């Protein structure tokens, strides 16, 4: 195989794996760092590690710092991959972000050709740049922010965004993207929001965040 120990879903796809599902990747190509991820092998060329999925409200996303650091949920259904995992993956090279949104027969997307998450000491600082798509550029507002949970507030408000909105995100004061919000909650700022597509009073039915090497698009 080209990559006996594929470090992301694009290497898995380059080995010949073409169907979406659970795959074992190996951080830094290291056999000892196995991580089971869901690969989206069909959207926009495939090769995508999914790290957030919302689709039915069964999982609770009002979780604490340790839980967002470690990941939670069923990776075949609603889940969060974990911030430690995201940092280790984005530290393996130059990665891009894709967000897929679906709601009552409508769809939209956003791609950011530069995406990285810092380590725990940086409180998982977000870098997200180079927008294209149809959802509207709602992540720009969050670029440069650290992550916040109700028990570790790093946002730019004197209040606690995560506590107030009962979610977690790279909050500022507070958000334009809230994809770890309260499922089906159309109250202002509470739901699964992508502001520049459907605003702050509409919770989106289906959302995925996913990443892959940015140069994979050029292959
Ligand atoms: Ca605060």
Numbering used by the authors: 1976 to 2194
Question: How is this structure described in the published paper?
Answer:
PNNs are a condensed form of neural extracellular matrix that include the glycosaminoglycan hyaluronan and extracellular matrix proteins such as aggrecan and tenascin-R (TNR). TNC and TNR share a common domain organization that includes an N-terminal cysteine-rich region responsible for the formation of disulfide-linked multimers, followed by 5-14 epidermal growth factor (EGF)-like domains, 8 to 9 FN repeats, and a C-terminal fibrinogen (Fg)-like domain. Overall, our findings provide novel structural insights in the interactions between RPTPζ and tenascin family members, prove that the formation of a RPTPζ–TNR complex is essential to the assembly of PNNs, and provide a blueprint to explore a potential role for a RPTPζ–TNC complex in neural function.
Using sequence alignments, we identified two amino acid substitutions that could account for the lack of interaction between RPTPζ and TNN or TNX. Second, S2164 in TNC (S1318 in TNR) is conserved in TNN but replaced by a histidine in TNX. The effect of the Y2140H and S2164H mutations in the interactions between TNC and RPTPζ were thus analyzed in an Alpha-based competition binding assay. Introducing changes to histidine at positions Y2140 or S2164 prevented competition, suggesting that each mutation is enough to eliminate interaction with RPTPζ. Finally, the crystal structure of this variant is identical to that of WT TNC, indicating that mutations at positions Y2140 or S2164 did not introduce any gross structural alteration that would account for the lack of interaction. Overall, these results validate our structural analyses of the interactions between RPTPζ, TNR, and TNC and explain why RPTPζ does not associate with additional tenascin family members.
